[PDB]
Design a protein around this ligand. Structure first.
Ligand code: U7A
Ligand code: ZN
Length: 257
């Protein structure tokens, strides 16, 4: 099955998922000099005060912090979006070294990791229906660079020992995702896709310009996770990122001058 290795990685995905070579694939390189300021874009509205986290899961490709999305509790609105998008989960992509790990790049620069806060358009009723729609999802992407620790990330870091291997989950209630945001909500936006199989072209990408800083020790703990299940040979969960895909007939818009 698909993964991030030599024999099942991104260059192989198109055989099972031909949309891998489609017209609106993600991630992409964000060329900052070519992105155009769009004064029509509204400020983002991130309303996470009532978020209800439930569980953290190692799914064999990353780890997901899952939320209760059966009501409008933590929602994303505004910016390029029409309607209300409910937070369902967040996860990260990261590298084996501090100079790689992000999926999006900025003027070809790779960050150490990238956080994805995944939201779905409530007009489609459930997440499975939303992924079948060109405007079904909104993913808020946030770059991580290595420097000072992010205090709001530590509760995630400290539970990773309990979900080392594929298929392990742990209770993860009362986690506040507002502690993972940078100061500025300035962003770039473009129409794209899920960055893993099934690579569905259902995502409005909103990528924040300002990275958050995490410590070397925090990212080192991400790198102790495993792709494998328990009782299988250890394969470290590192370099779980897809590289930049062709922009094709798309324009990246900036919320800021
Ligand atoms: N069992 C099992 C796992 C099944 N998942 C969903 C469970 C679900 C939840 C609500 C309603 C229906 C189904 C599957 C699941 O999540 N994805 C697969 C596509 C999908 C979505 C919904 C239904 C079928 C397939 C999305 C995974 C995904 C990939 C990449 C990014 S990224 N890097 O672009 O942000 C974000 C999220
Ligand atoms: Zn992702």
């Amino acid at each position: 099955h698909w993964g991030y290795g030599k024999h099942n990685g991104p260059e192989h995905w198109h055989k099972d998922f031909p949309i891998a070579k489609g017209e609106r694939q993600s991630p992409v390189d964000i060329d900052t000099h070519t992105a155009k300021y769009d004064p029509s874009l509204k400020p983002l509205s991130v309303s996470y005060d009532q978020a209800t986290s439930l569980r953290i899961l190692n799914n064999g490709h990353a780890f997901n912090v899952e939320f209760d999305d059966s009501q409008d509790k933590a929602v994303l609105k505004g910016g390029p979006l029409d309607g209300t998008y409910r937070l369902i989960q967040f996860h990260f992509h990261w590298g084996s070294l501090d100079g790689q790990g992000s999926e999006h790049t900025v003027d070809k620069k790779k960050y150490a990791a990238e956080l994805h806060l995944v939201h779905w358009n409530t007009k489609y009723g459930d997440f499975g229906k939303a992924v079948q729609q060109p405007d079904g999802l909104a993913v808020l992407g946030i770059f991580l660079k290595v420097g000072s620790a992010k205090p709001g990330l530590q509760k995630v870091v400290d539970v990773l020992d309990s979900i080392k291997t594929k298929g392990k989950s742990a209770d993860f209630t009362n986690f506040d995702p507002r502690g993972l945001l940078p100061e500025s909500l300035d962003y770039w936006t473009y129409p794209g896709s899920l960055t893993t199989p099934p690579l569905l072209e259902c995502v409005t990408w909103i990528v924040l310009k300002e990275p958050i800083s995490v410590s070397s020790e925090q990212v080192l703990k991400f790198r102790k996770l495993n792709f494998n299940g328990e009782g299988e040979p250890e394969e470290l969960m590192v370099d779980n990122w897809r590289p930049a895909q062709p922009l094709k007939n798309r324009q990246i818009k900036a919320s800021f001058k």
